[PDB]
Each structure stands twice: as structure tokens, then as C-alpha cells.
Amino acid sequence: MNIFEMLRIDEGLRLKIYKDTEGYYTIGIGHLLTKSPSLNAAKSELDKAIGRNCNGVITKDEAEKLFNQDVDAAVRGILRNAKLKPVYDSLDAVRRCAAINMVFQMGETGVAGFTNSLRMLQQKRWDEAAVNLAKSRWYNQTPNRAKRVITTFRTGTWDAYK
Ligand SMILES: Fc1ccc(I)cc1
């Protein structure tokens, strides 16, 4: 169990442009293409990301390559963020995966705003952090995925994914 397997479970794999839970054009293992309603705009982003004319379709190798880039970008965004880095550095490796998962789904800026949850996590008040994390649009809109991530923060185990 590692961040790649965890996010692969949470995001699935689709080789043609699809819409995420918010209605936004996406491809692969949860790679957001654009928030624009234009499918042509999404296709342009895809071609730029892959480096060829894709027609809205990629290979599994390409999906996995984008996925590695996206996971790394989430980690780098954490490490460059003055609010997120101290919390991340305080966590064990399993809980660090839960943190990356949140940043992958919502972005550095959104997670950096989870100020009270982050403090509880840094204080290792796991049950209180889990309660606080669920008081969110995130939990209400994607409750099964948020429950898995929250259980990972609460327990420091992979139990929710097993
Ligand atoms: F550094 C961190 C980034 C995101 C979370 I959620 C927790 C720690």
C-alpha cells in the first residue's frame, strides 16, 4: 500500500475524457483537464499534456505517466506551502498519504485552508481531527472517499483500503 495504489483506488482509470464528480473534464487516473464547459478546451489541454494529438483518448502508459506527474506535483505543493509543510513533516508515512490524497483531490490552496483540521493533525488529536474533517463540503459531496481518507488519518492504517 502506497500513495499510488491509494489514489488509483479512489480515482479509477479511464482512457477517454470523462467528467469528474464536479462535472469537469478529466482523463486517466483523475487528471483534471479544465473547468471550462468546452470539450475542445479539454482536448487542447490533453494534447498539451501528452505531447501529441490525442482526440480525447490516451494509453494506459500515458495515464500512468500523467498520474506520476500529478502525485509529484501534489507532494511538491505541500513541501512549498508554509501551512502544509510543518503538518506533513509531523505525520507518519501512512498519514502523509492521506494528506497527499486530499491535495490531489482539492489542490494545495483548498487544503491549506483546512486550518483547524491541520492543527488537530499536527497535535496528533486523531479522533478530533477526523470529526473536524467531516464538517466539510468535501465530505458531504464525496463521502465514501472522504471517509476512507479520514479513516486513514484517524488510524494511521490502510484498513479503509483493504
Ligand atoms: F502538509 C499537509 C498537507 C495536507 C494535509 I490534509 C495535511 C498535512
**b/e burial code for range 137-162 (CB count within 10 A of at least 16 → b):** ebbeebeebbbbbbbbbbebebebee
Q: Contact 28/17 with Cβ under 8 angstroms?
A: no
CA–CA dist 118, 115 (Å, integer): 5
Residues having CB closer than 6 A to ligand 1 are 78, 84-85, 87-88, 99, 102-103, 111, 118, 121
Specified resolution (Å)? 1.0
Domain 3-155, CATH: 1.10.530.40
Technique used to solve these coordinates: X-ray
Looking at 113-142, list the stretches that DSSP marks H as alpha helix, in order from N- to C-terminal side.
Answer: 115-122, 126-133, 137-141
Sequential DSSP letters for 13-74: -EEEEEE-TTS-EEEETTEEEESSS-HHHHHHHHHHHHTS--TTB--HHHHHHHHHHHHHHH
Largest Cα–Cα distance of the chain, in whole Å?
Answer: 49
Nearest CA to ligand 1 atom 6: 99
